[PDB]
Amino acid sequence: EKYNPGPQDFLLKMPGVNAKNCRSLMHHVKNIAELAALSQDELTSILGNAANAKQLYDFIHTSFAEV
Amino acid sequence: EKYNPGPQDFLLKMPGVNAKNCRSLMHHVKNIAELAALSQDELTSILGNAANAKQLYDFIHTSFAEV
DNA sequence: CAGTGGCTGA
DNA sequence: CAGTGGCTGA
């Protein structure tokens, strides 16, 4: 498909994303902007899995360094 | 000052990033959430380069399919 | 932002 | 989110 291996791949690079919920993610978000804009509740609603949701939401909110 | 290879490396995985503006980016954003929350005008203020800003914001604002 | 976890070997 | 483009060989 026309799904560029850039932002599309970026989704699967997360510890809570697979090709299965990837299609849902990209269809629910514009790109990286909406991807990181998603909330834990949003994730479960799109991914349909609490584990995948928490894992994805986790990385999105994983601070670079703990001071 | 950990800076795990997860969110930190994620920054350097962009077409408009380097290690020099990486320290600026992480200091201006919490993690991925703020990373994608940045605007093209903001990127220039952080990265200090229009090219890097446009390139970084480009990817952030890159549609999964049909860029 | 808007879609469901969209696949898989013989 | 909050820091400046934070480096580099002899």
Swiss-Prot record, chains A, B:
* PTM statement from Swiss-Prot or TrEMBL: Deacetylated by SIRT1.
| Superkingdom, taxonomy of origin | Eukaryota
Q: Where in the cell is it found?
A: Nucleus; Chromosome
Query: Where are the residues of the annotated region HhH2, dimerization with ERCC1?
Result: 1-64
The disease this record links to the protein is: Xeroderma pigmentosum complementation group F: An autosomal recessive pigmentary skin disorder characterized by solar hypersensitivity of the skin, high predisposition for developing cancers on areas exposed to sunlight and, in some cases, neurological abnormalities. The skin develops marked freckling and other pigmentation abnormalities. XP-F patients show a mild phenotype. XFE progeroid syndrome: A syndrome characterized by aged bird-like facies, lack of subcutaneous fat, dwarfism, cachexia and microcephaly. Additional features include sun-sensitivity from birth, learning disabilities, hearing loss, and visual impairment.
Binding partners and assembly: Heterodimer composed of ERCC1 and ERCC4/XPF. Interacts with SLX4/BTBD12; this interaction is direct and links the ERCC1-ERCC4/XPF complex to SLX4, which may coordinate the action of the structure-specific endonuclease during DNA repair.
Summarizing the function annotation, the protein's role is: Catalytic component of a structure-specific DNA repair endonuclease responsible for the 5-prime incision during DNA repair, and which is essential for nucleotide excision repair (NER) and interstrand cross-link (ICL) repair.
Q: Which family does it belong to?
A: Belongs to the XPF family.
What name does UniProt use for this protein?
Answer: DNA repair endonuclease XPF
Q: Whose protein is this, by species?
A: Homo sapiens (Human)
Q: Which gene encodes it?
A: ERCC4
